Design a protein around this ligand. Structure first.
Ligand SMILES: N#C[C@@H]1COc2ccccc2C1=O
Length: 282
């Protein structure tokens, strides 16, 4: 069923809440035993958001290999994403260790450091060229190289140095800065624009490690980003652009991380983004 028609049918009936609860009911449930170990309590931002053991990213150290991050592997679309929480004051070094070990080219950030008057994640990147950051626990150095500030997003060039080997890489930071404090954007135009700039960078491409995507919990806005990317990629691949079932793609992705898409408004926004993306030029 063409999703544009499914869309108008749900909207006219106002059943978004009922569709959303059907997804929550059918979603996978796998063990998260490592996340719940007492040694890892200060490595988790939210008590109810944990990576499944089967899909969690492991840090390459013997001490404690744990980070709140999951590998989402979409087999037919041929895309991989790492979805993670906003780093905490004691996990900023772990975050950059993961970016290094997984060979990521891009970091996608969908939240502001402060929202609704509360801190949603640590200030984990340098704000001035001449004031670099050193993460002593993981032996990494991070320098701001350049900054390009636009109306809806900012792109930063960063240099990450492995102080152990003196190798360096260029990391692109894509920061979507205008998601509202409450609800979802009214139009998906600016989100889709931002999405097609991450692609153009090469950050989502198979010659690099998976892109690192985060918001505060790493399930809501982060969910919306990878669901819309994968659905548009499948529509360019499948003979029948009408065979792409967004609810089925979301349940496949929820086999790899719990809770992806946090509200019925985020589900509706995801539909709007995909359809329009299929409109525009597609
Ligand atoms: N390349 C490219 C672009 C840029 O932004 C878009 C926004 C909505 C729908 C499609 C697109 C593209 O394909």
């Amino acid at each position: 069923m063409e999703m544009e028609k499914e869309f108008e049918q749900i909207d006219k009936s106002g059943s978004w809440a009922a569709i959303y609860q059907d997804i929550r009911h059918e979603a996978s449930d796998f063990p998260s035993r490592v996340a719940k170990l007492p040694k890892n309590k200060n490595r988790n931002r939210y008590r109810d958001v944990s990576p499944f053991d089967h899909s969690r990213i492991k840090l390459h150290q013997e001490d404690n290999d744990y980070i709140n991050a999951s590998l989402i592997k979409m087999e037919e679309a041929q895309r991989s994403y790492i979805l993670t929480q906003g780093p905490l004051p004691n996990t900023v070094g772990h975050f950059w260790e993961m970016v290094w070990e997984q060979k990521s080219r891009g970091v996608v950030m969908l939240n502001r450091v402060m929202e609704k008057g509360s801190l949603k994640c640590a200030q984990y990147w340098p704000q001035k060229e001449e004031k670099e950051m050193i993460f002593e626990d993981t032996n990494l150095k991070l320098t701001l190289i350049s900054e390009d500030i636009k109306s809806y997003y900012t792109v930063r060039q960063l240099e990450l140095e492995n102080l152990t080997t003196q190798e360096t890489r260029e990391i692109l930071h894509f920061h979507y800065t205008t998601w509202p404090d409450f609800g979802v954007p009214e139009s998906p135009a600016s989100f889709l624009n931002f999405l097609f700039k991450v692609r153009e960078s090469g950050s989502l491409s198979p010659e690099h490690g998976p892109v690192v995507v985060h918001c505060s919990a790493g399930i809501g806005r982060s969910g919306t980003f990878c669901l819309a990317d994968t659905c548009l990629l499948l529509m360019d691949k499948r003979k029948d652009p009408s065979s792409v079932d967004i609810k089925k793609v979301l349940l496949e992705m929820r086999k790899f991380r719990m809770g992806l898409i946090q509200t019925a408004d985020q589900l509706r926004f995801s539909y709007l983004a995909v359809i329009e993306g299929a409109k525009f030029i597609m």
